[PDB]
Structure formats: C-alpha cells, structure tokens
Write a protein that holds these residues in place. Sequence first.
Motif, short mmCIF file in Angstrom:
data_model
loop_
_atom_site.label_atom_id
_atom_site.label_comp_id
_atom_site.label_asym_id
_atom_site.label_seq_id
_atom_site.Cartn_x
_atom_site.Cartn_y
_atom_site.Cartn_z
N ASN A 546 1.99 -0.76 -1.26
CA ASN A 546 2.57 -1.50 -2.13
C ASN A 546 2.03 -1.15 -3.72
O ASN A 546 2.63 -0.97 -4.69
N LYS A 570 1.06 -9.45 -10.57
CA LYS A 570 2.18 -10.31 -9.87
C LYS A 570 1.69 -9.68 -8.52
O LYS A 570 1.44 -10.50 -7.34
N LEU A 571 1.48 -8.38 -8.11
CA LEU A 571 1.02 -7.56 -7.01
C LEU A 571 -0.27 -8.16 -6.62
O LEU A 571 -0.73 -8.29 -5.23
N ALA A 573 -1.68 -11.02 -7.18
CA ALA A 573 -1.54 -12.54 -6.79
C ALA A 573 -1.15 -12.46 -5.27
O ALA A 573 -1.64 -13.30 -4.54
N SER A 574 -0.09 -11.78 -5.18
CA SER A 574 0.76 -11.76 -3.77
C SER A 574 0.10 -10.90 -2.69
O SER A 574 0.31 -10.82 -1.46
N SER A 575 -1.00 -10.00 -3.02
CA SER A 575 -1.66 -9.26 -2.16
C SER A 575 -2.77 -10.18 -1.45
O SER A 575 -2.85 -9.79 -0.12
N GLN A 576 -3.09 -11.14 -2.14
CA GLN A 576 -4.21 -12.06 -1.35
C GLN A 576 -3.49 -12.59 0.05
O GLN A 576 -4.07 -12.92 0.92
N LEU A 577 -2.16 -12.95 -0.13
CA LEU A 577 -1.28 -13.87 0.82
C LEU A 577 -0.88 -12.93 1.91
O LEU A 577 -0.95 -13.37 3.13
N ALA A 578 -0.82 -11.74 1.91
CA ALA A 578 -0.61 -10.71 2.85
C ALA A 578 -1.58 -10.36 3.80
O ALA A 578 -1.62 -9.70 4.69
#
Length: 580
Positions: A546, A570-571, A573-578
């Motif tokens: 990604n 954006k990437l 922020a959402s990288s932590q969750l994956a």
Amino acid sequence: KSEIAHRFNDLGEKHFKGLVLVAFSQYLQQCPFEDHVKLVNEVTEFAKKCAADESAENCDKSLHTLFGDKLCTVATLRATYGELADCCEKQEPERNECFLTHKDDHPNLPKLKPEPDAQCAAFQEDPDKFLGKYLYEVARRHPYFYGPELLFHAEEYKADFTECCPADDKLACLIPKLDALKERILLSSAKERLKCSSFQNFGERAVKAWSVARLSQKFPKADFAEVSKIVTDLTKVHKECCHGDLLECADDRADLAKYICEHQDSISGKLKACCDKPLLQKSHCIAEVKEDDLPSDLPALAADFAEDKEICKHYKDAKDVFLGTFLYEYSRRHPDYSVSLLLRIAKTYEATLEKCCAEADPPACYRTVFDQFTPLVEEPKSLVKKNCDLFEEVGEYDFQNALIVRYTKKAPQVSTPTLVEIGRTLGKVGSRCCKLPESERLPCSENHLALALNRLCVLHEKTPVSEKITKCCTDSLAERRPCFSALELDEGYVPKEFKAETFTFHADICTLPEDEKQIKKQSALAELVKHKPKATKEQLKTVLGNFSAFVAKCCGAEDKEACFAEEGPKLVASSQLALA
Ligand SMILES: [Zn+2]
C-alpha cells in the motif's frame, strides 16, 4: 639484519607503497588522502636508506614499531583521533593491539558515487594518484580488507578506466563495470572479515578447521599432508593480514602461491589456468578456483573411523591429527555440503567418540557414528529449498523484505540501518545461489549466509543491544546460522512507540535511483515491525504494498508534493490498524 629493507627488496617499491598505504588507511580511517601519501613516502624513504646500509641506527626495529611510530607522528592526532593518541603512549606489541581495538567497522563515510566524466579526467592527469586514492578509499571503508587482494582490485579498476575513458560514451562502458567491482569488493571484504572475526572470537584452531574443510573440498586430489601444509601456511598469512602485519602477509601469500603452483599436478587440475598468470591474478585465481573433479580412488571411511577396534586409542593418543584426518576425508568427499555443516559434522564425530570411549564397549557404540550425520544434513537442505522456492516465486526485493521482517522479529533492538543492510545482503544470496546447479546451492547459500551473519555480529560488537544476538554470535562459529534460524520473536521486547514522521514520505523519494527508493521503503518496513512485532509477515507485506502504490502514484502526479501531503497521513493512520 633489517626487516623493512628485506621486505622492500622482496616486494618492490610499487607493492610496498601500495600495502603501506592500505595499512595506514585502515588504522587511521579519517585522515585525508594527502596525509597518508606523505607518511608512505617518509617510510619508503627510510626503507631505501636502510636497504643501502642495514647496520644504520633504527633499521633493526620491527615493522610494528616503525609503522606505529609513523602513525603517531600524524598532525592533529588527539583531536581527529582521541583514542588512538592513547595507543601512542604504549610500546609494541601493546600499541598495535590497542590500534586494532579501535578500527571502525562502520565508519559512515559517503558512498563512492562513480562520476565517469570527472574521474577519467583525474586518471588521465595522474594515474598513480588516482589509483592510489582508490586503495585509500576502499581500505578506510573496510579496515580489515585483505591487502594483497585490494592491490588486485585496484588493477581491475585501472583496467576499467583504461578501456572506458578513450571511448565516446564514458558512462555506458564504465558504470556496469564499476558496479560489478563494487559488488566484488563487498563480498571479498566480507570473506576476509569472517577470517579475522574467527581469529578474534574463536582463535587459530577454528580458522584451521574451517580452512581444512574448504581446501579439502577445493582440492580433493591432494593428500592430507599437502592440505595440512597449505592450511598452516594460509592460516599464518591471514593471521598476519588480520593482525596488520601487511608486508609479511603479502610475502607469505606470494610464497604460498609459488608452492601451490609448483605442486599443481598433485594438488588440482583446475590450477593450470591460474598458474599461467601474473602473481596477483595468480593468487586471486587460486583463492577463487573452482573445486576439482572428485577422484575415482577416494577411500571408504567406515573401516578407519567406524569399524577399526582401536579408535579410542588413536583418538586418545593423537586427537588433533585423527580428527583433522576425518575432517579432511569427509570434506573432500562432500563438496555438496557447506563448510559450517562439515564443521558441525566433525564436532558430532568428536562428541560421539568422547561418549563412546568412556563407556564399557566403545566399538559397538561408535559403529553407528556416520549415521548421526544424516539428521544434520536435512535441516540446512530444507532451509535452502524453502528459501530458494520463495526467491524464485517473489524475486529479490520481496525476498529481502521477507528476511528484514524475519530478522527484525529476531532482534528488534537492532538499528534499522543494520537490519536493512543485513536483510538486503541475506536477500542477495538468493540471486547468487538459487540459479546455480542444484548441488551447489547449499554450500553457496550457507557460506554466504555466514558472511552476512558475521557482519551483523561485527556491528553488534560495536553497538551491543540484544542478549539473544550475543549468544548466537559468541557460542560456536559452526552453530551460528542454525542458532539465528532458531530465534523466534523476542517477547521481552517492548513495542516501539508510534511516530508518524517515520512513515511519512515526500516527493524527494521520486528522483532517487531504484536501489535507494527500496532502502527507504525497506527502512519503513523494519520500523513497522518494531512498532507491531506480533504482526504476521503477510500483514506487513500488504501494508508495504500500500505504501509502494501510494509512492508510485504521487511520483506520477502533476502536483507531486500536494499528493504526498493529502494521501500520506490517511495511509499512516490506517496502517496502524492493519497490524493488530
Ligand atoms: Zn603483528
């Protein structure tokens, strides 16, 4: 009477000056080129003056005394080199041990970026300066580089420039050549550093066992006496180079090449090509020579090492010689095995005898000793098939990424640059070894893994961060790769606190050459693991993909920096969750 005059006479002015420049460049790695040149000249002048009259005052002195003295004359010594000025108080041999302690295996000088246009200029103008600068630049970056071998690479470097500078397109001729040579320097440096590291951390005994194994595989036609002779001599050569005795090291290396080539029919059929060459090429070729065809007359080994009913007497009387003979015999029969595996096998053979001979019926116990090797062969063979099947599916980059994830989990306290360097090196092993004929992969893979793991261990000596790494690096040279392979996630490690800037890219990455682009991405990948150590390699692969897509997009954008600015966070922020 005079050792410095003697060596000047044997080696010649050119090589003498070359080796002395290398020596001084390795001990004093921050000194500018022009300071070392003049030191070389002063010492060379002293040698010519001693060569004229050996009874003159100070000509009796040792090479360590004369070189150490010269290095301690250098301007701004205490400011530029705080610690080495302390070494200068001491006498020899204390002074040299102190100097050696302070060689820097990670000097952090700039990359040697080849500028074909400006370099061909300086090569035309003054080749002796230009060739000399190459010795100094390589040597200070690799302070344990095999000195005679570096003179050899300088001759290739000269030849690349001789071919490519008169030509129309300087770059397209020269760039691919200089890229190949930098690779050869990297590898060769790593080979010599392992030899020095073995002396340092395991002593001359391990260096000998290692050499017996390898030279036996290389020269299976040679008898145990000839192999033993070459090991003894080669061991003294590398002991001298590693200790800094560079003139002695070069002379003894020439001598060994002469011996080997005098007995080439006895030693190996592959030497003929090597022995019809100039001396530096000659020694290089011997060191890199292909293994000889397996001889038809090789002996069955059960009768002497398994069936003989007096093994416990032979082993008790001459442990060193008996086991040496075993290692030589087993290794000349197994060029399909890695050196480390043979040394594991030798240690197992010894262990089986120690146990069997203390017990009531040793013959019945040790009769099955060769069968204890079977399990030891399996573990590395699978590991190589496994990692070669991955390399071939995914290619260098993704393979490196797999290895960076894998080693960062083993040692998350290690700095990201080191983890990235080692993972990349470990990944280049695939590109070197998996393409080879299928019998050659195991030795190639494990031998090149040993180089890369030694680099990790050498850096760890400087900057110790991990009890786990220390144990693997210090326990047993032969068991090192299996020790590392057996490490799982370090579960005493505390996840590194998240820092957005670490994973934040900007449009500067877009101009970079591809290899440097990957390093940035790979650095972020290491950092992802440190933040989320329990994350599976497959999650990490997806997140990095990604990031790569994001990078490819904004580099292709009209407004490059506005793209990184909006899409980046954006990437992040959402990288932590994956990774949970
Ligand atoms: Zn020495």
